Design an enzyme around this catalytic site. Structure first.
Site, PDB file in Angstrom:
ATOM      1  N   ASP A  99      54.735  39.456  45.042  1.00 37.56           N
ATOM      2  CA  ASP A  99      53.832  38.415  44.636  1.00 37.56           C
ATOM      3  C   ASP A  99      52.626  38.877  43.845  1.00 37.56           C
ATOM      4  OD1 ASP A  99      52.690  39.828  46.820  1.00 37.56           O
ATOM      5  OD2 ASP A  99      52.245  38.080  47.915  1.00 37.56           O
ATOM      6  N   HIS A 100      52.345  40.177  43.800  1.00 37.50           N
ATOM      7  CA  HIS A 100      51.126  40.698  43.169  1.00 37.50           C
ATOM      8  C   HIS A 100      51.244  41.149  41.718  1.00 37.50           C
ATOM      9  CE1 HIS A 100      49.032  40.465  47.033  1.00 37.50           C
ATOM     10  NE2 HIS A 100      48.033  41.053  46.423  1.00 37.50           N
ATOM     11  N   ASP A 164      47.762  43.696  53.908  1.00 37.81           N
ATOM     12  CA  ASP A 164      47.027  42.792  53.062  1.00 37.81           C
ATOM     13  C   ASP A 164      45.936  42.254  53.981  1.00 37.81           C
ATOM     14  OD1 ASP A 164      47.357  41.192  50.334  1.00 37.81           O
ATOM     15  OD2 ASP A 164      46.517  39.865  51.782  1.00 37.81           O
ATOM     16  N   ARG A 446      38.011  35.133  47.704  1.00 35.61           N
ATOM     17  CA  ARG A 446      37.042  36.105  47.234  1.00 35.61           C
ATOM     18  C   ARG A 446      36.579  35.698  45.849  1.00 35.61           C
ATOM     19  NH1 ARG A 446      40.813  40.778  49.945  1.00 35.61           N
ATOM     20  NH2 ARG A 446      39.532  40.453  51.897  1.00 35.61           N
ATOM     21  N   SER A 641      39.473  43.989  50.325  1.00 36.63           N
ATOM     22  CA  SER A 641      40.879  44.247  50.366  1.00 36.63           C
ATOM     23  C   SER A 641      41.260  45.545  51.084  1.00 36.63           C
ATOM     24  CB  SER A 641      41.281  44.198  48.918  1.00 36.63           C
ATOM     25  OG  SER A 641      42.435  44.850  48.637  1.00 36.63           O
ATOM     26  N   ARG A 643      43.501  47.845  50.516  1.00 38.80           N
ATOM     27  CA  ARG A 643      44.199  48.882  49.744  1.00 38.80           C
ATOM     28  C   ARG A 643      43.909  50.315  50.179  1.00 38.80           C
ATOM     29  NH1 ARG A 643      40.778  46.597  44.705  1.00 38.80           N
ATOM     30  NH2 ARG A 643      41.816  44.708  45.510  1.00 38.80           N
TER      31      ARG A 643
HETATM   32  O1  LIG Z   1      45.487  45.212  48.010  1.00 35.75           O
HETATM   33  C1  LIG Z   1      45.898  44.343  47.280  1.00 35.75           C
HETATM   34  O2  LIG Z   1      47.015  44.338  46.817  1.00 35.75           O
HETATM   35  C2  LIG Z   1      44.985  43.194  46.921  1.00 35.75           C
HETATM   36  C3  LIG Z   1      44.798  41.865  47.760  1.00 35.75           C
HETATM   37  O3  LIG Z   1      45.751  40.768  47.746  1.00 35.75           O
HETATM   38  C4  LIG Z   1      45.057  42.593  49.086  1.00 35.75           C
HETATM   39  N1  LIG Z   1      44.168  42.617  50.303  1.00 35.75           N
HETATM   40  O4  LIG Z   1      44.417  43.654  50.857  1.00 35.75           O
HETATM   41  O5  LIG Z   1      43.296  41.836  50.590  1.00 35.75           O
HETATM   42  C5  LIG Z   1      43.340  41.309  47.597  1.00 35.75           C
HETATM   43  O6  LIG Z   1      43.096  40.123  47.987  1.00 35.75           O
HETATM   44  O7  LIG Z   1      42.443  42.074  47.102  1.00 35.75           O
HETATM   45  S1  SF4 Z   2      44.319  36.158  48.834  1.00 38.01           S
HETATM   46 FE1  SF4 Z   2      45.573  38.018  48.422  1.00 38.01          FE
HETATM   47  S2  SF4 Z   2      47.702  37.454  49.003  1.00 38.01           S
HETATM   48 FE2  SF4 Z   2      46.513  35.500  48.782  1.00 38.01          FE
HETATM   49  S3  SF4 Z   2      46.918  34.740  46.659  1.00 38.01           S
HETATM   50 FE3  SF4 Z   2      45.008  35.964  46.579  1.00 38.01          FE
HETATM   51  S4  SF4 Z   2      45.479  38.096  46.073  1.00 38.01           S
HETATM   52 FE4  SF4 Z   2      47.423  37.003  46.752  1.00 38.01          FE
END
Ligand SMILES: O=C(O)C[C@@](O)(C[N+](=O)[O-])C(=O)O
Ligand code: SF4
Length: 753
Positions: A99-100, A164, A446, A641, A643
Site C-alpha cells: 500500500d505504500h 506501522d 499526521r 512513524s 520506520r
Molecule cells: O514507515 C512507514 O512506512 C510510514 C508510515 O505509514 C508508517 N508508520 O510507521 O507510521 C507513516 O505514517 O509515516
Molecule cells: S496513516 Fe500510514 S498506513 Fe494509513 S494511509 Fe497514511 S501512510 Fe498509509
C-alpha cells in the site's frame, strides 16, 4: 472449546479465548484488584502469567502476540532481517500489504498499473519471500494495511503487532494492536517472546452522543489538543462510558488510529453491539457469537483504575480541524478562518483530500457523498482540487456499487488507487512550486512539515472527511459549514445540511477483485533473489559486536534543536524507493533535523575540514576516518512513524549513541534493537552544557546494568571537563542486544553457533 478460525484465510488457526481466560484468572488471583480492558487483553497474552512482574510504567512484559501484519515500506527490511536469521518459516499468522509505493498522479487504475511496473522488483521480492516463509500477501491495489486488517483480521481480544505506527486502528474492534519496528516483528515471526514495557492506562469516558456535523474524528482531534503529541507516551488509551454505543465500529477505529499522534502505546474500545454488527456484516458472525460467550473478558472490570481520566461529552463536541504543522494544535472549524487570518496561514485551500485508513470507511464515504450531493443539487462543484482514497478494494467496489463514488466524481473529485498515496508523500504534486506557501486540508492524521508533498511551506490541516468535502466546495477556510451560506448556480443562497448516511451497506459488502495470495504451505521451494547490483534491495551484513571498551572522544555529528520526528531522521516520499537498500537510504540521514549551531537543515560542520556540508556526507567521512559519533537531541526525539530505518541508518554510518531529553517509544526500542545506546539526560538542563565542538566519553559500559546511570565526561576544547549522568531503560535482555552488536546478532548466537 469452540473451533472458530481467526480469519477466512486461516481456517485452521483458532481463536483462543480459553487461553485468554485462563491467563486473566492466573493474573487477577495475583493482583487481587480490578483490571482495565487493556490489562485483561495484554496480561491475558503473557508468556508466563504466574511469574511475570507486573507494574504499570515499570516492568517489561514478555508477551505472545496472535499475528503479525506488515506494509510494503517496512516489510522489505523486516524480511531481509528474517532472511538473515536463517529460520525456515514464520511462527504465527503474518501478512504483507502492498500500500505504500503507489504514487498518486493520474488516479486509480492508471496509477496502479504504473506502480506495478515501476515497483516490480520489490513486489516480486515480497511475494516470493512471502511464499517461501509462509506469509500471506495482499497484492498492490488490495487496500491500505489497517483497513484490510479491520475487515479481515482484527477481532475482540486479539494481540496483534504491525510494522506501522497506525496499527492501533484495530482497537476499534476491541483488540490490542501495537505498532513496532521490523526487528520486533522478526522476534514474533521467529517464535521468541515479544517484550513491551508495561503500560500506564489513560481512561477517556465518553458521555452523550454525536450530533450533526460532529463525527468520530472530532473526539480524537479534541483528545490530541488536550493531551498534546507527547501526552500519551507509555500509556494505552481506553475509551469507555455510555457514549461509546453512539459510535460506529469504523468510527471507533478512527479514534483509536489517531491516538498514534499523542505517542500512546495503542488505544482500545470495549466489545459492544456495534462491533458485533460490524463482525456479522464482514462475514464473521461466528466470531461475534464466540465473543458474546467470552464477553466478560472483553470489557473492563467494574471499578478498574485509570492513571489519568479525561471526560468528553459527545453532545457538546463540535467540528474541529487541527494543524498546521502538528496534529495537537486544535481549532474548532468555526474559528480556524479567523486564526488563519491572524497567523498568516493561507485561507485558500488548493487541495482537499479524503480517505486514508483513518477515514476511508463506507460511512465516511457516505457522509462525504451526502455533503457533495447537496452542492450538486445547486449546480456547484469543488473550488479546490479534491481527491478520494478508498481504504480497500471492498470499500471501492461497494461505494461504487451504492453510487457514492459517482457523486464524488460529479463534484470534481479524482478517485486514487486504494493506497497511502498523498498520506506519506507518494503524490506527484505539480500545482505549487517547492517552497510555495499554500494550504491543503485532509481527513488524514499526521500533518508534519513536508510530509504530504515534500514542500515545507504547505500548511496541512487534518479534519473529518465531511468537513474536507464542505471546505473543498467552498475553497476557503473562512467557511463554517454549520453557519455559512453558499450561492448556487441559480443565484439562491443555500446552507449545507449536516450529513446523514448508513454506517454499513444495507446489502452485503461487494468484495471487489481477488487480491489475496495464500502461501503454498506445501511447496515453499521459492528462491528469493536479490540482485547484488540492485539499487532497491540489498542483503544485510551483520553489525560489529561491542569491543568491550568504553566510548571515548566521541564526535558530535549534530546537536538537534526542537522537534525531531522520524521523517526528519529518515524522510519518506522519494526515499521509499530505497526502503530495502540500507546504503542507499542512508543518504537521507538527518537531512531534515535543524542544527542548533546555525539553525539550518542538512548543514553541519565537518570537524576535520571545517567546511559546513550535508549530514550524510559528514557521517560517512567520520566513518571512513574512524571517528565515532553521537547525536544530541531535545524532547520526544524520534516522534512519529515506526520506520526502523531511523535507527539502522545511524548505525550503518558509524554512530554510537543518541543522547536526548526524551524518546518516543518505538524509536527508542528500534535504537536498542540495532545496537546503539539511546540515553537520556538525568538532568535535562545538561543539554545546554554540550556545544557542537565538545567531545564526549561515555563510561561504565563494562558494568552496564538495569537502573544504573552511565557517566558522561564532556571534554571542552579549552581543557575543561564536566561530568554528567545519563539514564537508560535497558533491562538484561536488551544489554545482551547491545553487547552482541544488535538483537539479530544475539538471536543468531542462540542458534548454537
Ligand atoms: O514507515 C512507514 O512506512 C510510514 C508510515 O505509514 C508508517 N508508520 O510507521 O507510521 C507513516 O505514517 O509515516
Ligand atoms: S496513516 Fe500510514 S498506513 Fe494509513 S494511509 Fe497514511 S501512510 Fe498509509
Amino acid at each position: 472449546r469452540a473451533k472458530v478460525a481467526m480469519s477466512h484465510f486461516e481456517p485452521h488457526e483458532y481463536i483462543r479465548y480459553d487461553l485468554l481466560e485462563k491467563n486473566i484468572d492466573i493474573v487477577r488471583k495475583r493482583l487481587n484488584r480490578p483490571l482495565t480492558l487493556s490489562e485483561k487483553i495484554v496480561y491475558g497474552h503473557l508468556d508466563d502469567p504466574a511469574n511475570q512482574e507486573i507494574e504499570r510504567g515499570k516492568t517489561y512484559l514478555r508477551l505472545r502476540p496472535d499475528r503479525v501484519a506488515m506494509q510494503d515500506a517496512t516489510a522489505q527490511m523486516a524480511m531481509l532481517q528474517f532472511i538473515s536469521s536463517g529460520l525456515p518459516k514464520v511462527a504465527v499468522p503474518s501478512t504483507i500489504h502492498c500500500d505504500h509505493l503507489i504514487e498518486a498522479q493520474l488516479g486509480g487504475e492508471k496509477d496502479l498499473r504504473r506502480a506495478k511496473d515501476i515497483n516490480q522488483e520489490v513486489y516480486n521480492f515480497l511475494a516470493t519471500a512471502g511464499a517461501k516463509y509462509g506469509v500471506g500477501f495482499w497484492r498492490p491495489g488490495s487496500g491500505i494495511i489497517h483497513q484490510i486488517i479491520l475487515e479481515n483480521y482484527a477481532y475482540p481480544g486479539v494481540l496483534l503487532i504491525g510494522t506501522d505506527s497506525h496499527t492501533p486502528n484495530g482497537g476499534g474492534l476491541g483488540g490490542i494492536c501495537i505498532g513496532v519496528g521490523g526487528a520486533d516483528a522478526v522476534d514474533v515471526m521467529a517464535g521468541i517472546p515479544w517484550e513491551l514495557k508495561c503500560p500506564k492506562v489513560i481512561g477517556v469516558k465518553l458521555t452523550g452522543s454525536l450530533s450533526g456535523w460532529t463525527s468520530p474524528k472530532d473526539v480524537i482531534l479534541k483528545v490530541a489538543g488536550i493531551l498534546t503529541v507527547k501526552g500519551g507516551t507509555g500509556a494505552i488509551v481506553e475509551y469507555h462510558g455510555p457514549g461509546v454505543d453512539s459510535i460506529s465500529c469504523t468510527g471507533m477505529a478512527t479514534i483509536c488510529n489517531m491516538g498514534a499522534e499523542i505517542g500512546a502505546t495503542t488505544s482500545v474500545f470495549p466489545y459492544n453491539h456495534r462491533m458485533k454488527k460490524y463482525l456479522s456484516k464482514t462475514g464473521r458472525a461466528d466470531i461475534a457469537n464466540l465473543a458474546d460467550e467470552f464477553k466478560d473478558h472483553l470489557v473492563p472490570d467494574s471499578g478498574c483504575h485509570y492513571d489519568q481520566l479525561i471526560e468528553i461529552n459527545l453532545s457538546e463536541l463540535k467540528p474541529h480541524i487541527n494543524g498546521p504543522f502538528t496534529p495537537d494544535l486544535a481549532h474548532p472549524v468555526a474559528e480556524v478562518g479567523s486564526v488563519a487570518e491572524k497567523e498568516g496561514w493561507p485561507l485558500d485551500i488548493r487541495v482537499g483530500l479524503i480517505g486514508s485508513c483513518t477515514n476511508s470507511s463506507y460511512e465516511d464515504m457516505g457522509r462525504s457523498a451526502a455533503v457533495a450531493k447537496q452542492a450538486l443539487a445547486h449546480g456547484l462543484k469543488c473550488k479546490s482540487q479534491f481527491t478520494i482514497t478508498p481504504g480497500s478494494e471492498q470499500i471501492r467496489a461497494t461505494i461504487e456499487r451504492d453510487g457514492y463514488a459517482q457523486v464524488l466524481r460529479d463534484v470534481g473529485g479524482i478517485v486514487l488507487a486504494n493506497a497511502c498515496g498523498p498520506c506519506i508523500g507518494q503524490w506527484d504534486r505539480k500545482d505549487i512550486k517547492k517552497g510555495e506557501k499554500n494550504t491543503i486540508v485532509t481527513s488524514y492524521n499526521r500533518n508534519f512539515t513536508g510530509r504530504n508533498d515534500a514542500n515545507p511551506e504547505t500548511h496541512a490541516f487534518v479534519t473529518s472527511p465531511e468537513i474536507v468535502t464542505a471546505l473543498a466546495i467552498a475553497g476557503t477556510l473562512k467557511f463554517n459549514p454549520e453557519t455559512d451560506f453558499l450561492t448556487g448556480k441559480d443565484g439562491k443562497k443555500f446552507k449545507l445540511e449536516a450529513p446523514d448516511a448508513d454506517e454499513l451497506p444495507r446489502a452485503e459488502f461487494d468484495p471487489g477483485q481477488d487480491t489475496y495470495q495464500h502461501p503454498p504451505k506445501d511447496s515453499s521451494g521459492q528462491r528469493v533473489d536479490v540482485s547484488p547490483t540492485s539499487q532497491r534491495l540489498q542483503l544485510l551484513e551483520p553489525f560489529d559486536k561491542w569491543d568491550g571498551k568504553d566510548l571515548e572522544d566521541l564526535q558530535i555529528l549534530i546537536k538537534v534543536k526542537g522537534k525531531c520526528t522520524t521523517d526528519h531522521i529518515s524522510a519518506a516520499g522519494p526515499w521509499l524507493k530505497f526502503r530495502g537498500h540500507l546504503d542507499n537510504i542512508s543518504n537521507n540521514l538527518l537531512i531534515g533535523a535543524i542544527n542548533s549551531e546555525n539553525r539550518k537543515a542538512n548543514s553541519v560542520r565537518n570537524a576535520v575540514t571545517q567546511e559546513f556540508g550535508p549530514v550524510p556526507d559528514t557521517a560517512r567521512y567520520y566513518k571512513q576516518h574512524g571517528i565515532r559519533w553521537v547525536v544530541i537531541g531535545d524532547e520526544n526525539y524520534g516522534e512519529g512513524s515506526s520506520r526502523e530505518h531511523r535507527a539502522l541508518e545511524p548505525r550503518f554510518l558509524g554512530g554510537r549513541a543518541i543522547i536526548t531529553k526524551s524518546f518516543a517509544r518505538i524509536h527508542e526500542t528500534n535504537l536498542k534493537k540495532q545496537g546503539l545506546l539511546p540515553l537520556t539526560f538525568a538532568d535535562p538542563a545538561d543539554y545546554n552544557k554540550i556545544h557542537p565542538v565538545d567531545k564526549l566519553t561515555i563510561q561504565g559500559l563494562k558494568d552496564f546494568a538495569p537502573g544504573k546511570p552511565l557517566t558522561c565526561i564532556i571534554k571542552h576544547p579549552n581543557g575543561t571537563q564536566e561530568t554528567i549522568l545519563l539514564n537508560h531503560t535497558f533491562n538484561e535482555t536488551q544489554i545482551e542486544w547491545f553487547r552482541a552488536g544488535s538483537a539479530l546478532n544475539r538471536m543468531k548466537e542462540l542458534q548454537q553457533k
